[PDB]
Amino acid sequence: HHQMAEEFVQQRLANNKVTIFVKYTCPFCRNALDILNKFSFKRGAYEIVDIKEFKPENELRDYFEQITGGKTVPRIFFGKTSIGGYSDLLEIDNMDALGDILSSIGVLRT
């Protein structure tokens, strides 16, 4: 009668994929999505996951804390590895490292 938060998350991750967990009412979420949307992704290599799908919310927050070190969306994954949140993405974007990293992990179209 209850999907574990761990399964909800891990089912959406893959080695050569970007996965971002969001709530659409969060401004930091839309800011993060705006960074990622600058790029063109291969089929299936990018998923935007709406966490309002999961209940209870505290269980998913608690899981994100254990594997990412923070509770609140956005939570960004490059492959199965957590990058953290909006600030972490911005940092990599501002230093012009995001393109190289997305090339390495095989998610970019062409």
UniProtKB/Swiss-Prot annotation:
One MF annotation (Gene Ontology) recorded for this entry: glutathione disulfide oxidoreductase activity
Paired cysteines (S-S): 26-29
InterPro entries: GLR_AS (IPR011767), GLRX1 (IPR047185), Glutaredoxin (IPR002109), Glutaredoxin_euk/vir (IPR011899), Glutaredoxin_subgr (IPR014025), Thioredoxin-like_sf (IPR036249)
Alphabetized UniProt keyword annotations: Disulfide bond, Electron transport, Redox-active center, Transport, Virion
Glutaredoxin domain sequence ranges: 6-109
Subcellular localization, as worded in the UniProt entry: Virion
GO CC list: virion component
Family annotation (Pfam families): Glutaredoxin
Gene induction: Expressed in the intermediate phase of the viral replicative cycle.
UniProt-listed SUPFAM superfamilies: Thioredoxin-like (SSF52833)
Entry function: Has thioltransferase and dehydroascorbate reductase activities.
Family recorded in the similarity comment: Belongs to the glutaredoxin family.
Protein name: Glutaredoxin-1
Originating organism: Ectromelia virus (strain Moscow) (ECTV)
Phylogenetic lineage: Viruses, Varidnaviria, Bamfordvirae, Nucleocytoviricota, Pokkesviricetes
